Amino acid sequence: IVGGYTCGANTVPYQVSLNSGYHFCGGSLINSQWVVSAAHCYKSGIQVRLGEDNINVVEGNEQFISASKSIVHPSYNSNTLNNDIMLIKLKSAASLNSRVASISLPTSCASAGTQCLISGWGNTKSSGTSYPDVLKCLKAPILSDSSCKSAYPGQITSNMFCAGYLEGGKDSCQGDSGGPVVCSGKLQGIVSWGSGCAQKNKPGVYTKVCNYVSWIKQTIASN
Ligand SMILES: N=C(N)c1ccc(CNC(=O)[C@@H]2CCCN2C(=O)CNC2CCCCCCC2)cc1
Ligand SMILES: [Ca+2]
């Protein structure tokens, strides 16, 4: 997260870290056994870390649970990042508490101008790299369809939206991938892609979760 703020320990209790001997992506807890992340985060050997604040120190409240299933959308395209969504099943159910909590799926899509919360342990620099120990947060609005497509002509599908700030300085970034964009208590986006981080005229691009609610439900019920 570039230009954000320290969230505060466990203030984003649905935020998970995906770990393979290091943090490599975020995710969102949607029930005690399932996490939503990005398809481009797929790999073997995923450990889900719930209840985290400082990802480099055991502080208490962590739960570490291996992934037992990682389900990339069948129509994911790694070149266009269309359908950039993955479901992870946990080997055992998480224990839900004030610090480890699910986020609701949308019942309808969000509109332009809606303010959302974006969070993660990704890079905090727009030039160069710096990775934080504790979770970072950013408030950011959804942009209009016309401004999104203006920004990235011929690259925005109906399964994407743009959010953030065209003036530069405030964005998600590498390592935030797969993490949440939450609007009015609903998981509306997944951190997916962008041109650089926090660059002028190049906002963040997010997977449009409302288009996937039926697929998510249908996939969880059959697995
Ligand atoms: N909000 C941001 N600025 C931002 C940018 C990047 C990321 C992490 N995502 C990435 O690095 C992803 C993974 C594979 C290549 N990615 C890219 O972001 C690479 N760039 C292209 C841009 C235009 C073509 C359409 C399809 C997307 C890729 C996360 C957030
Ligand atoms: Ca920790």
Side-chain angles (χ1 to χ4, degrees), residues 1-199 201-223:
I1 304 288
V2 179
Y5 60 98
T6 295
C7 303
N10 308 114
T11 56
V12 190
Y14 50 86
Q15 173 85 51
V16 310
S17 159
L18 308 184
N19 184 285
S20 63
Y22 61 97
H23 164 92
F24 70 88
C25 273
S28 302
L29 190 65
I30 62 159
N31 63 40
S32 65
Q33 295 185 91
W34 292 85
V35 165
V36 170
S37 186
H40 81 259
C41 293
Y42 172 83
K43 58 165 83 187
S44 302
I46 301 179
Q47 189 183 62
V48 178
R49 297 189 169 195
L50 304 101
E52 285 281 21
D53 191 43
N54 187 324
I55 48 168
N56 295 306
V57 177
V58 175
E59 295 180 286
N61 304 313
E62 295 95 348
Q63 295 174 47
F64 295 175
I65 307 176
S66 301
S68 62
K69 304 198 162 150
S70 305
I71 305 179
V72 166
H73 197 275
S75 296
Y76 169 61
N77 185 296
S78 62
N79 291 309
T80 49
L81 298 180
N82 198 26
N83 304 300
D84 193 11
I85 185 169
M86 170 173 69
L87 291 172
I88 297 170
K89 194 178 185 179
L90 302 182
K91 180 176 181 196
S92 64
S95 299
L96 263 24
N97 57 49
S98 58
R99 298 179 179 97
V100 182
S102 64
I103 187 68
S104 290
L105 293 178
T107 53
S108 45
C109 298
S111 79
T114 295
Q115 291 287 160
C116 308
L117 185 68
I118 313 179
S119 50
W121 293 274
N123 191 1
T124 64
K125 302 287 238 62
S126 63
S127 309
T129 74
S130 185
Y131 290 101
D133 298 314
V134 301
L135 188 67
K136 303 293 180 167
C137 276
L138 179 67
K139 298 230 183 80
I142 300 183
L143 312 187
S144 69
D145 297 347
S146 60
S147 295
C148 189
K149 287 179 170 102
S150 277
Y152 296 109
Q155 303 152 92
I156 302 300
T157 63
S158 65
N159 304 309
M160 301 169 193
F161 62 93
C162 291
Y165 299 92
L166 296 175
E167 63 265 38
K170 287 176 150 187
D171 201 0
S172 59
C173 199
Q174 275 72 33
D176 292 322
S177 290
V181 181
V182 168
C183 320
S184 301
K186 309 296 187 196
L187 181 68
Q188 294 281 14
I190 305 165
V191 179
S192 183
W193 64 275
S195 181
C197 311
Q199 301 298 301
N201 289 133
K202 292 294 160 160
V205 191
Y206 303 94
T207 310
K208 195 177 178 165
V209 175
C210 65
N211 291 356
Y212 299 95
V213 174
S214 298
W215 177 81
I216 290 167
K217 279 112 168 336
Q218 288 186 349
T219 301
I220 295 171
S222 61
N223 284 274

